[PDB]
Scaffold this motif. Structure first.
Motif, PDB file in Angstrom:
ATOM      1  N   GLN A   1       0.711  -1.259   0.004  1.00 27.67           N
ATOM      2  CA  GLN A   1      -0.115   0.127   0.016  1.00 27.67           C
ATOM      3  C   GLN A   1       0.951   1.258   0.067  1.00 27.67           C
ATOM      4  O   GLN A   1       1.817   1.320   0.773  1.00 27.67           O
ATOM      5  CB  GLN A   1      -0.966  -0.053   1.202  1.00 27.67           C
ATOM      6  CG  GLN A   1      -1.984   0.999   1.190  1.00 27.67           C
ATOM      7  CD  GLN A   1      -3.268   0.382   2.257  1.00 27.67           C
ATOM      8  OE1 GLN A   1      -3.343  -0.539   2.314  1.00 27.67           O
ATOM      9  NE2 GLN A   1      -3.693   1.657   2.882  1.00 27.67           N
ATOM     10  N   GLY A   2       0.428   2.141  -0.949  1.00 32.68           N
ATOM     11  CA  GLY A   2       0.984   3.502  -0.855  1.00 32.68           C
ATOM     12  C   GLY A   2       0.043   4.457   0.076  1.00 32.68           C
ATOM     13  O   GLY A   2      -0.514   4.259   0.994  1.00 32.68           O
TER      14      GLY A   2
ATOM     15  N   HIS B   1       2.599  -0.251  -4.901  1.00 31.51           N
ATOM     16  CA  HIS B   1       3.886  -0.452  -5.706  1.00 31.51           C
ATOM     17  C   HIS B   1       4.342  -1.969  -5.149  1.00 31.51           C
ATOM     18  O   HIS B   1       3.757  -2.390  -4.132  1.00 31.51           O
ATOM     19  CB  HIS B   1       5.085   0.245  -5.003  1.00 31.51           C
ATOM     20  CG  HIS B   1       4.930   0.511  -3.492  1.00 31.51           C
ATOM     21  ND1 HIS B   1       4.297   1.201  -2.785  1.00 31.51           N
ATOM     22  CD2 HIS B   1       5.963   0.154  -2.719  1.00 31.51           C
ATOM     23  CE1 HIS B   1       4.513   1.279  -1.377  1.00 31.51           C
ATOM     24  NE2 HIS B   1       5.651   0.591  -1.461  1.00 31.51           N
TER      25      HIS B   1
ATOM     26  N   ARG C   1      -3.499   1.053  15.637  1.00 32.70           N
ATOM     27  CA  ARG C   1      -2.540  -0.012  15.952  1.00 32.70           C
ATOM     28  C   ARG C   1      -3.017  -0.568  17.203  1.00 32.70           C
ATOM     29  O   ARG C   1      -2.976   0.106  18.324  1.00 32.70           O
ATOM     30  CB  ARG C   1      -1.190   0.347  15.932  1.00 32.70           C
ATOM     31  CG  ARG C   1      -0.349  -1.088  15.844  1.00 32.70           C
ATOM     32  CD  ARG C   1       0.965  -0.863  15.460  1.00 32.70           C
ATOM     33  NE  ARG C   1       0.896  -0.059  14.117  1.00 32.70           N
ATOM     34  CZ  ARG C   1       1.990   0.352  13.436  1.00 32.70           C
ATOM     35  NH1 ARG C   1       3.121   0.438  14.028  1.00 32.70           N
ATOM     36  NH2 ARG C   1       1.857   1.113  12.116  1.00 32.70           N
TER      37      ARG C   1
ATOM     38  N   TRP D   1      -0.589  -3.428   3.581  1.00 34.87           N
ATOM     39  CA  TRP D   1       0.451  -2.652   3.742  1.00 34.87           C
ATOM     40  C   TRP D   1       1.964  -3.268   3.469  1.00 34.87           C
ATOM     41  O   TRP D   1       3.010  -2.832   3.181  1.00 34.87           O
ATOM     42  CB  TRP D   1       0.732  -2.227   5.303  1.00 34.87           C
ATOM     43  CG  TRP D   1      -0.178  -1.190   5.608  1.00 34.87           C
ATOM     44  CD1 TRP D   1      -0.725  -0.267   4.929  1.00 34.87           C
ATOM     45  CD2 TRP D   1      -0.369  -0.607   7.037  1.00 34.87           C
ATOM     46  NE1 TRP D   1      -1.748   0.422   5.537  1.00 34.87           N
ATOM     47  CE2 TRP D   1      -1.254   0.450   6.975  1.00 34.87           C
ATOM     48  CE3 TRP D   1       0.237  -0.948   8.289  1.00 34.87           C
ATOM     49  CZ2 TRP D   1      -1.629   0.958   7.958  1.00 34.87           C
ATOM     50  CZ3 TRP D   1       0.006  -0.241   9.271  1.00 34.87           C
ATOM     51  CH2 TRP D   1      -1.040   0.698   9.033  1.00 34.87           C
TER      52      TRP D   1
ATOM     53  N   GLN E   1       3.480  -5.033   5.499  1.00 36.99           N
ATOM     54  CA  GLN E   1       4.494  -5.022   6.817  1.00 36.99           C
ATOM     55  C   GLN E   1       3.408  -4.606   8.116  1.00 36.99           C
ATOM     56  O   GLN E   1       2.197  -4.491   7.694  1.00 36.99           O
ATOM     57  CB  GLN E   1       5.342  -3.960   6.603  1.00 36.99           C
ATOM     58  CG  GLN E   1       4.664  -2.366   6.447  1.00 36.99           C
ATOM     59  CD  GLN E   1       5.702  -1.299   6.262  1.00 36.99           C
ATOM     60  OE1 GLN E   1       6.466  -1.017   6.882  1.00 36.99           O
ATOM     61  NE2 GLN E   1       5.209  -0.582   5.182  1.00 36.99           N
TER      62      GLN E   1
END
Ligand SMILES: [Ca+2]
Ligand SMILES: [Ca+2]
Ligand SMILES: [Ca+2]
Ligand SMILES: [Ca+2]
Ligand SMILES: [Ca+2]
Lengths: 319, 319
Positions: A73-74, A143, A227, A262, A264
């Motif tokens: 994800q950008g 990306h 988070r 993401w 990550q």
């Protein structure tokens, strides 16, 4: 699979025109400019639209397979789209339907790519030019982990064109993208009031190639993208990518594998990448589950803990 | 220069305390956390806060001097502040009053920096720790063109601290930042209805060490950051960095120099980098004016056209 370009011209025709004339395709319906990025305001940075050849020396559409490791994800709130893409990559054949064969930057390349989406009762050809949003010589949005690979970035662009802008991809439902990739109807399961055989339902869904997602409910808009101490993200589409089992203290333990779009930031409890549980699972068993320590967004959980921590699961069957 | 920290301690006291214990300074008043980044909320992406040492191997505070080439804007609409900083860089004594003298990552480094801002009737001393927002191993906000240089990124953090958050800096007043850097009295001129003696006023002001900015008027807020066909950004604070006369095809054309705080994206027309006007100009007058062709942010234009296309010019005088 129906032509949708305003010219009325087909992906092969437009591509072939460009090759003959010796130019690159410029898309008249989704221009490389500020209105295709955002509708609610102009961006505060100098975006420069760039073809993948202008970004790296040796661009490639697909490189090492179109895989979930290629979904990072950008700076856009489209976790829901990308989780759908990562899920779509577990079925080579459901993927070939959204991504037509033989696209590359090699012979035949004219700056034009095309993807197929299901909209409203039908299979649309969506055609794009490969000019992508960049800033500081880098992609800002989706990306691949490998910066030479562009199929994921292009698919997101085509999907942004589908919705009229990149900004329209901000906030959505995995079901929306899941349906658009499959032409199926999504079922929602609710994690703590699921059938007794819920595990088997997911195992069998995954096996016949269905797209699985899941997420944590957000109590308020204030909680979006928070988070948790366990390393999980609230109000955030995850891909369910694996269903499996191991022997632990001599009992069969039902495991589920989940992926953050993401690429990550991961779960930090039982069966997470560096948890004690793994030290007592041998190398054969561990190679079978593909366990490794990597902040790649993909982690295992005990199905019991998954049910407790997550609130929703979506299944979308192929057809 | 007034202490502003909740601890009551000075920059020197917190610094000595840190290297006494062999640790790195964490700022209680502006934590490396979302509250310091945004206030409606979170980023759609995982910013990790990294000291410059964790970002780059050989970090340094200042390199090649503290110059306007070090002011490349990140993902934040604080052109107004940046235009001011760049303007400030042309008066080295003024700049030393904002940036204390012996700061570096060498001996005596303890993760703690400080800057000084004029607030109404007193200079404030604003201390930060050097944890900066990064995503994908790159600074997100303000950064030098040299990736090993951190003074400007730090200044911006500290200025974000002064205003409560990095989001606080989205949109603002160029005069406000110029007065915070100097203590001077502001002066706004309407370009189209300015004194018949205006060019000298600006030349005198620039030579005097005063800060000068300029900008184009925003009709809508939806016009904010829109580009002209001449490659200027509307609603966007520029620094005026040079004033100079040159002779060219018989006449003497008054030239003005302007700089986009993006560090990139420039004027299109006469006297732009790759404009033909220059050829008619000797190499001895070219390298006095420092004419080069590079996407600097910085460019010359003919004073007539400057009046024609800009709307307001703001000067912050010390005298
Ligand atoms: Ca790949
Ligand atoms: Ca992992
Ligand atoms: Ca420098
Ligand atoms: Ca525009
Ligand atoms: Ca330039």
């Amino acid at each position: 699979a129906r032509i949708t370009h305003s010219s009325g011209q087909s992906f092969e025709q437009m591509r072939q025109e460009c090759l003959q004339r010796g130019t690159l395709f410029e898309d008249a319906d989704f221009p490389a400019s500020n209105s295709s990025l955002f509708y609610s305001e102009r961006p505060q940075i100098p975006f420069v639209w760039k073809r993948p050849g202008e970004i790296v020396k040796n661009p490639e559409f697909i490189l090492g397979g179109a895989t979930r490791t290629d979904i990072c994800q950008g700076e856009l709130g489209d976790c829901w789209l990308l989780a759908a893409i990562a899920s779509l990559t577990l079925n080579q054949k459901a993927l070939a339907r959204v991504i037509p064969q033989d696209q590359s930057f090699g012979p035949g390349y004219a700056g034009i790519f095309h993807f197929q989406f299901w909209q409203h009762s039908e299979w649309l050809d969506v055609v794009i030019d490969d000019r992508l949003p960049t800033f500081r010589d880098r992609l800002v949005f989706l990306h691949s982990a490998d910066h030479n690979e562009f199929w994921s970035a292009l698919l997101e662009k085509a999907y942004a064109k589908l919705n009229g802008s990149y900004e329209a991809l901000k906030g959505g439902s995995a079901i929306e993208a899941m349906e658009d990739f499959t032409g199926g109807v999504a079922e929602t399961f609710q994690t703590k009031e699921a059938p007794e055989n819920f595990y088997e339902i997911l195992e069998k869904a995954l096996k016949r190639g269905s797209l699985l997602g899941c997420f944590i409910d957000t109590r308020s808009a204030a909680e979006s993208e928070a988070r948790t101490p366990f390393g999980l993200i609230k109000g955030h589409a995850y891909s369910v990518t694996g269903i499996d089992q191991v022997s632990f203290r001599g009992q069969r333990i039902e495991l589920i594998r989940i992926r953050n779009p993401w690429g990550q930031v991961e779960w930090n409890g039982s069966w997470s990448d560096s948890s004690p549980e793994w030290r007592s699972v041998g190398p054969a068993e561990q190679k079978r589950l593909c366990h490794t320590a990597l902040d790649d967004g993909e982690f295992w959980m005990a199905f019991k803990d998954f049910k407790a921590h997550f609130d929703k699961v979506e299944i979308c069957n192929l057809t």
